[PDB]
Design a binder for this molecule. Sequence first.
Ligand SMILES: [Mg+2]
Lengths: 365, 268
Amino acid sequence: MLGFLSARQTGLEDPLRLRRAESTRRVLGLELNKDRDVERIHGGGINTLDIEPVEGRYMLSGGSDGVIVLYDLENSSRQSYYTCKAVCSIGRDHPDVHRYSVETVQWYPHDTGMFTSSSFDKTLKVWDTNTLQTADVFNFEETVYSHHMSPVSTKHCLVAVGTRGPKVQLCDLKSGSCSHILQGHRQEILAVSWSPRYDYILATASADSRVKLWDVRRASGCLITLDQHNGKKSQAVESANTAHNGKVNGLCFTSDGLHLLTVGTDNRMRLWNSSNGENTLVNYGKVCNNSKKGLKFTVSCGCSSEFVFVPYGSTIAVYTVYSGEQITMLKGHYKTVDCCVFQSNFQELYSGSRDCNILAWVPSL
Amino acid sequence: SDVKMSLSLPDKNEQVLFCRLTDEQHKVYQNFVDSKEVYRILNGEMQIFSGLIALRKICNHPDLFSGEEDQFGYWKRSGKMIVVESLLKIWHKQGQRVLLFSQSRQMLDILEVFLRAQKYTYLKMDGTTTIASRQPLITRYNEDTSIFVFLLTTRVGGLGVNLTGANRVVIYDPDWNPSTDTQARERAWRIGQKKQVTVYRLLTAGTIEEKIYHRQIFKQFLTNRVLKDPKQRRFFKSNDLYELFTLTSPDPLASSSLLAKMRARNHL
Ligand SMILES: [Mg+2]
């Protein structure tokens, strides 16, 4: 590493080299945090986490008990040991608390003054973070499994919602229009994710073992349907062209948005060319998941090699996205891990699981 | 209105004459609303269509009981036909061209007979005319001004044709759909209309026709509520119930504008 510092000082290597190499080294040295703790307030398992995209300071967490906790991740104390204190809380005494489990919570991109939370109580609530009051509510005829706002859209502000209905809802936060729907799936839509690269590209994964990419501006259904075999087993499109041999319960675009990682209940993760949905045949081995709802997993950013952190039983499996090589198992949870969210500023990880714990993984040394 | 100044269209008027049932027409209407068929309709036993269509026919002209100069469809037995006779006389003496619409083909035939009874040179186009001759006919009426009146059914005479040669337009019979009447009246006020146009929409006062006018005003208000503005005034002229069988002859956003808009919408 002194070689890295010397090369940076002497201009031999771009500082990009040291930055991404050290980010990768930090991610590889991920371990149970020696001096850090997260305050425990959820009475039930944490189903979702979200660190705000700008300044990466505050973290939302939705629990199976319906409460939403807002934590400050910064060590505002002077000690090396600190607990991520809870700033705010939609608790059981809040007038607008979710009646059932909160399954997805997401900070509004471009601004930390608002966030959103969808629950199995058939509601997508939009909260003002300052007053901590519901600015809006969208009701659905069937329970919400996931939702996502575009991390890129300066123009549109649509929330793509996947419920147990076979339709992907698009709720306009600009003047409230939840009527827009996308047809083409056949069972519950367990995951939805906007492309970080393209403004109007949305990937939706449903229990019909299919993943569809939509240009929501378009009037002609999905753009691409992901196919495991790319055409080896080709059939007229009524039941073929499946992404997995089970329910596809998780989506994640890579950092650049040029590839898509789909995890399904066939104990398989697959990497897809996001421009034509071709399977890249990256192996990843066996990725154990049996979740009946959406599975939240994230990818690394700002590193020499991209990593993907997938909940794997009661562990976090870290894989290399483009080679599939298994990095490691982060092993500190006592029950199945529901979500993991990656802090890209310091290569940190926060994992929420059914054991009512949010565990922080920090690079060692 | 946003294009009229930038298009140099002539002036428009949209008068609505409330015609008066004649003694014989009023008698037939009163006898029908006092008949047993309408009584059964109001009890839900029969469909409403028979009574509705019968009243519309009576207001158009008493062709139910076809009563020399007493042939079928004689103009003096219908008030709207009397008004049309007066209007046609006035407009002909003013050297203008008229566009005479009707919802009913039978009433169009009656108007055609009344026009041959006068010396007016007419030209007819309804659903029975061969399609191949329709655009020719229109061109004829647009070309030579010797033709005075253009008879039309609103379903064929309306709906996209260009009849700018016509100067006056008279909608003889209201329809349940407002849009039929709107397109019929815009057949004349179009790009290429070099003369001031007026629309005369005939309704019989205190009859089913006025109730239909009310229903389609309500429909137009409902349409304007979502097409031009949502501050539309409530329809208060009537409750629009099933008592139209009565004769009542007169005499990136930074989460603050977005949050503010959410609050605005929710407080409503
Ligand atoms: Mg046209």
